[PDB]
């Protein structure tokens, strides 16, 4: 009967809670109370990219730490040269309702999608000299919220329907679907080794998934509202999530519970974006108050504030070399910080 | 001191800038409409008279209209509704024949209250199309309005009942000093709907220009 299964599920949840309690012998704050603070981080704006004529919804660095891809609600996906502020490409979109971008870690392809429920893959390197639509991956019943390349032929996507998918690009088919969430999946982060990935959903939960096997390995809770952003710690053993609770949280996979919470009484607005700096000491979060806060990942203290956006900071990213920080906002601009 | 290739790259970037500006100029001279309505509300008839998002283009009096239908997208509205902030107007379709079918009118009222009082549409106006008035006349002749509105008092005739529904929908607006509701009664075979939308949009544009020049 349903009642017996409900009772068994409640018992298993209690068992998991007790197991997690047993492992909570110390807090990250207690252990990190004996290390020096990073100090005051005063990062300044080194560039301003002035092409878009609408709200920028997604940005993605290239692996060379010099090229960027941005997408705005005016279609017009733009590939930028950060060093010279040169526009390398301007790709017109078949649907202006774009919400995610991705830059393949080879530089040969770019992906984007949104309210059309399709993930479009564009080839950047063609004999004809123009950017062409290489693939249109259809199969999601909801909006596309995030997409990330694993290689030139594999891409992982998250949808408004409570599902993630892994797509072969040649064939144009879902190879494995991830079906555990009860709410819209909003974010998506790949592990550095590209064997696991974490997805945060509107059910106020994050899930660690195995790409090859195709099953939810772990589920992390604690947030009170939806999770909008998620990012892996550089070593792949931890990840940070940002929610509409005006809170970020750092979770550890091996301990299988929350380690830390980043919040302040003066912050009452949701978090749009989250990223780590190289070595993971700093945690950058873009908020709805037109601001980006820099937190010390080991000590809850706030290190800095990247002011300078006149509308909410919708996305940010850190280069693979760690030199700069890109932030794009609902103002048509995106800035580079150092 | 740039190298020759650097100068060529700068030239190509400037060409890209020129194209982007031209596209922005073209896009600004366009009227954006968000089409909302309950299931079977008749918004398909309006789309005639005028698997994710559906985009319909048309023109009227040299004015270009882009209508966006989001009814096929069943997900958390709170996560993509802000995408339509800045839309020129919202066209909300309600079927008048739905008063005695299943409380459908109450579902429509709840959706209208959610959209009208939404924080993203505080200054966005609503064109309210009340559809299926012939079927409504038939049913109201055969069935009472009190099924949907137990507190209704007045003639169980077409005019008073229709006016009652209109004011019931219009009183859900809790911001009467910021936005306007333009209500039109429509039917299956009609020709004035496009003119209705054009007139409402022109009024909205004039009011926006007055705000811009500072007269409000």
């Amino acid at each position, epitope marked *: 009967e349903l009642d017996q299964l409900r009772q068994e599920a409640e018992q298993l949840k209690n068992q998991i809670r007790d197991a997690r309690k047993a492992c909570a012998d110390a807090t990250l704050s207690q252990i990190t109370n004996n290390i020096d603070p990073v100090g005051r981080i005063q990062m300044r704006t080194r560039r301003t990219l002035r092409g878009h004529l609408a709200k920028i919804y997604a940005m993605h660095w290239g692996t060379d730490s*010099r090229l960027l891809v941005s997408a705005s609600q005016d279609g017009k996906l733009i590939i930028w040269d950060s060093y010279t502020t040169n526009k390398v490409h301007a790709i017109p979109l078949r649907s202006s309702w774009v919400m995610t971008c991705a830059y393949a870690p080879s530089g040969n392809y770019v992906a984007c999608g949104g309210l059309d429920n399709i993930c479009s893959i564009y080839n950047l390197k063609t*004999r004809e000299g123009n950017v062409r639509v290489s693939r249109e991956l259809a199969g999601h019943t909801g909006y596309l919220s995030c997409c990330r390349f694993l290689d030139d032929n594999q891409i992982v996507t998250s949808s408004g329907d409570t599902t993630c998918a892994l797509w072969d690009i040649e064939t144009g088919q879902q190879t494995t679907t991830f079906t555990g969430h009860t709410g819209d999946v909003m974010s998506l982060s790949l592990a550095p080794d590209t064997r696991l990935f974490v997805s945060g959903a509107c059910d106020a939960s994050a899930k660690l998934w195995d790409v090859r096997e195709g099953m939810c390995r772990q589920t992390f809770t604690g947030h009170e509202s939806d999770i909008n952003a998620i990012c892996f710690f550089p070593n792949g053993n931890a990840f940070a999530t940002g929610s509409d609770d005006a809170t970020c949280r750092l979770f550890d996979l091996r301990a299988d519970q929350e380690l830390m919470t980043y919040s302040h009484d003066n912050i009452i607005c949701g978090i749009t974006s989250v990223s780590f700096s190289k070595s993971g000491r700093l945690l950058l979060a873009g908020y709805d108050d037109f601001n980006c806060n820099v937190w010390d990942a080991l000590k809850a203290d706030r290190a800095g504030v990247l002011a300078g956006h006149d509308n909410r900071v919708s996305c940010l990213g850190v280069t693979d070399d760690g030199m700069a920080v890109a932030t794009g906002s609902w103002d048509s601009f995106l800035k580079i910080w150092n | *001191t740039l*190298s020759a*290739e650097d100068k060529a790259a700068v030239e190509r970037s400037k060409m890209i800038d020129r194209n982007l500006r031209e596209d922005g100029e073209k896009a600004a001279r366009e009227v954006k409409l968000l089409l909302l309505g309950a299931g079977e509300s008749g918004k398909s008839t309006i789309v005639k008279q005028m698997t994710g998002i559906v985009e319909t283009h048309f023109t009227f009096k040299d004015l270009h209209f882009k209508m966006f239908d989001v009814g096929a997208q069943r997900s958390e509205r709170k996560k993509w509704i802000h995408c339509f902030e800045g839309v020129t107007a919202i066209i909300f379709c309600v079927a008048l024949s739905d008063y005695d079918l299943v409380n459908r009118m109450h579902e429509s009222m709840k959706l209208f209250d959610s959209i009208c009082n939404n924080k993203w549409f505080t200054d966005t106006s609503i064109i309210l199309f009340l559809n299926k008035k012939d079927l409504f006349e038939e049913k109201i002749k055969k069935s009472p309005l009190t099924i949907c509105y137990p507190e209704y008092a007045g003639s169980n005739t077409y005019e008073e009942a229709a006016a009652y529904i209109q004011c019931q929908f219009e009183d859900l607006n809790k911001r009467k000093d910021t936005k306007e509701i333009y209500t039109h009664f429509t039917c299956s075979t009609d020709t004035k709907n496009v003119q209705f939308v054009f007139d409402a949009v022109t009024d909205v544009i004039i009011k926006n220009n007055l705000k811009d020049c500072g007269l409000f």
Partner: single-chain antibody
Amino acid sequence: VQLVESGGGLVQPGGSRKLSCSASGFAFSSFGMHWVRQAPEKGLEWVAYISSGSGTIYYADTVKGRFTISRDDPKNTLFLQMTSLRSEDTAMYYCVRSIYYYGSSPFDFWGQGTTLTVSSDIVMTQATSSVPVTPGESVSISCRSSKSLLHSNGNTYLYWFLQRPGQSPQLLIYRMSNLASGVPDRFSGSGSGTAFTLTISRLEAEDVGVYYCMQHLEYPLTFGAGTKLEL
């Protein structure tokens, strides 16, 4: 991708000729175009450049004031109007494609060319004019320049082209170290300012021909004499 030149022939001194190059297979409007020429028994000589958008025009000094370069993007045609022709203008003219953005490969595609018969720059030196070699061996071709080609932005603007018997030049290396698309990994390039080397490992057939080094640091573009490999 196809660039077909036409309009060549035999002219008397003092006459004029309008050469044309019909382009197909690519976004012609997005590419800058070059006119290059080769004398009957000599190396390559850069003639003219017209940029994408027709904003920038450059001419060689030997043709300035006489030649005019133009393009019709809708018809995908490139025109070279030559007036006051001299015996020095007798040559085969090639149209060359070139696109400029970060990471691009300019001078990537060359036409077949058309023959015309008339009745403070940087000097590139190809010290060796000929090199006999057997298949399976390694070869090294050297090129020198008057001034360092290394710019403050990190790029060394050296290009290596290979011209096989009866064929138009094809790009091997761009910016001294980058292997062109479709080129076997046998080829490699290295060097520092004023001294550059192209290394061919496991020399095979169809590598016979003339290798040219070109600088793209400053206009006018200048070629070396060309080093010939024969089996």
